[PDB]
Amino acid sequence: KTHVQLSLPVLQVRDVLVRGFGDSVEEVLSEARQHLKDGTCGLVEVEKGVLPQLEQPYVFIKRSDAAPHGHVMVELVAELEGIQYGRSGETLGVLVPHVGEIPVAYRKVLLRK
After folding, report:
1. Which residues contact 82 (CB under 8 A, 6 or more apart)?
2. What is the CA angle 30-17-7, rounded to 5?
3. What is the DSSP letter of 25?
4. Is the dihedral of CA 37, 26, 28, 87 positive or negative?
5. What distance lies between CA 59 and its chain's CA centroid?
6. Looking at residue 92, what DSSP letter applies?
């Protein structure tokens, strides 16, 4: 399917144990997509002071459209040293590996895969 319904655990930035997906734009987008497929991907809501506490390159989920079955349609955009790879809507958050951190909430998304 071109889209997959996912419920992403929302993590507090200070709980996150693995603060990025890798070392290149291509690797982080690759790893983000693999973790989303495997159910091992978390979401950190972006506020003042969050991104400097995570590792670049960043992978964002961004709104791709204006929400089937409560799932916001999203796509992946990576960022490295202020340049973004992809073009999309408003940021819903920054993706990170999930390795068992307790979430504060879930974000229902329809991921363009």
Report:
1. none
2. 60
3. H
4. negative
5. 6
6. E
Domains of the chain: 3-112 (2.30.30)
Method by which this entry was solved: X-ray
Residue 53 makes CB contacts below 8 A (sequence gap 6+) with: 13, 14, 19
The C-alpha angle with vertex 91 and arms to 78 and 96, in degrees rounded to 5, equals: 55
Strand ranges in the chain using DSSP code E only, listed in sequence order? 3-10, 41-44, 58-63, 72-80, 83-85, 91-97, 105-112
How far apart are the C-alpha atoms of 108 and 113, rounded to whole Å? 15
Cα–Cα distance between 71 and 79 in angstroms, integer? Answer: 24
- Measure the CA angle with vertex 39, ends 37 and 41; round to 5°: 95
Q: How many residues in total does the chain contain?
A: 113
Q: How many CB atoms lie within 10 A of CB 60?
A: 23
The dihedral sign for the CA sequence 29, 14, 7, 102: positive
- Rounded-to-5 percentages of helix, strand, coil across the chain: 20, 40, 40
